[PDB]
Homo-oligomer: A and B are copies of this chain.
Amino acid sequence: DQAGITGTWYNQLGSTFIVTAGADGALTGTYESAVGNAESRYVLTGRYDSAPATDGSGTALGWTVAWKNNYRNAHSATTWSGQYVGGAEARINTQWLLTSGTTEANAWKSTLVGHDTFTKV
């Protein structure tokens, strides 16, 4: 699914996920969030299963953005964990964890959780 995954994806918020899937299981690219204290593109890296099951299961993958670029630094990082589902209506279905750097007193409220769906349209 290297060809399937590589490209430009969009989630339900209008964020833009630009990724290249490598033969070796690497994901590399950029993320632009349509929401929050973020602007322009941020570096991402991740991994995917380069030899998925052939029984109709999705392709497991994940990636990370640290929210620092040349414009802003939110002192936080999001990881998306999900699966790629190929086909006419290809999708990447994810759950994510957004951790902020906090003091120890605030560490109990360091992490947001949510879910994003990415499509090619």
Name A residues whose Cβ lies closer than 8 Å to a Cβ of B: 13, 24-27, 35-36, 43-53, 55-68, 73, 75-83, 85, 93-105, 107-115
Query: Interface SS of chain A: helix, strand, loop or mixed?
Result: strand
Q: Is the CB of B62 within 8 A of A77?
A: yes
Point out the residue from B47, B53, B57, B75 that lies within 8 Å of A77, measured CB to CB.
B47
New contact pairs (16) apart from A36-B108, A62-B66, CB-CB < 8 Å: A25-B68, A35-B105, A46-B64, A47-B77, A50-B66, A53-B101, A57-B101, A58-B101, A62-B97, A77-B81, A78-B81, A95-B114, A97-B113, A98-B109, A109-B114, A110-B114
Q: Is the CB of B47 within 8 A of A43?
A: yes
